[model samples]
Target: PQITLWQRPLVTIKIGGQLKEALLDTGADDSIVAGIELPGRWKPKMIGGIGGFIKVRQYDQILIEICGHKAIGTVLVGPTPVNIIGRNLLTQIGCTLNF
Candidate 1:
């Protein structure tokens, strides 16, 4: 696998009439939307977390853009304190964490 460093700034995601600021975490495996009610059409999948492997579902597919880089990916809606932009996205753009 190829690795690339990313130093993108924080971006905002609008969902359910709310705009949220999220950290772009390159180490994370998936994208997450915090405190949003998931759409009913989502199909659930089991995911491993700090607690353990928990069931989750894809709430929506969102278009994310940062510093002219853009990509569309599924958002996992959950009760998290913060939203995360993960590797699933960065890898597509050949991006890695700069810090």
Candidate 2:
């Protein structure tokens, strides 16, 4: 499926059998999810970006279905304004931007 670019390419995503709206942020290298209960192994990690750095729980090998394209990647569980599907998972889903 294809999606047109906008101010924020917000899309519906399914994670852990639940659905949530997420931003397809091309600028982000890694994905970040909100306070949702995640399964499997996790470690404490610090990540930095436009707003600066923050400590978060790093969860790897998580399954995320982005607008029907399923991908397995790392998702950081932390406090964020919105959930972001970054290049890490976007690449797997073959998401690209065309001008």
Candidate 3:
């Protein structure tokens, strides 16, 4: 769906068959989902935020359904303040920013 910049870019997504909201952030490089338990072994990694770098569990090849579109990529599980749908998944969903 075409969206205006002024509107909040939050959208509903399905992960682990559960529905949740996530911010469709074009500025972010990686996607982050908080507090959910995902099955599989994950690696420890640090990613940069606006304030500083944070440690998170990196789960690869996870399927995410965003606004009815399917996307598969790396999803970071951490104590992030909010759920963010970054470029990794955005690109797969054909999300682009326009003025």
Which model scores highest in lDDT? 3
Candidate 1 per-residue C-alpha lDDT over 1-99 given as tens digits, one digit per residue, 9 for 90 to 100: 333434545666555446677776766798776676544577777666687665656755666663356677777766665678778876765675443
Stretches off by above 4 angstroms in model 2 are none
What pairs collide in candidate 2?
Answer: none
For each candidate in the order shown, give its overall lDDT on alpha carbons: 0.65, 0.88, 0.89
Clashes of each: 2, 0, 0
Q: Alpha-carbon error at 44 in model 1, in Å?
A: 0.8
Per-residue CA lDDT of model 3 for 10-91, tens digit only, reads 8998999778899998888999999777999888899998788889889999999999999889999988887999999999
Worst 10 residues of 1 by lDDT: 1-10
What local lDDT score does residue 14 receive in model 3, on the 0 to 100 scale? 94
lDDT of 3: 0.89
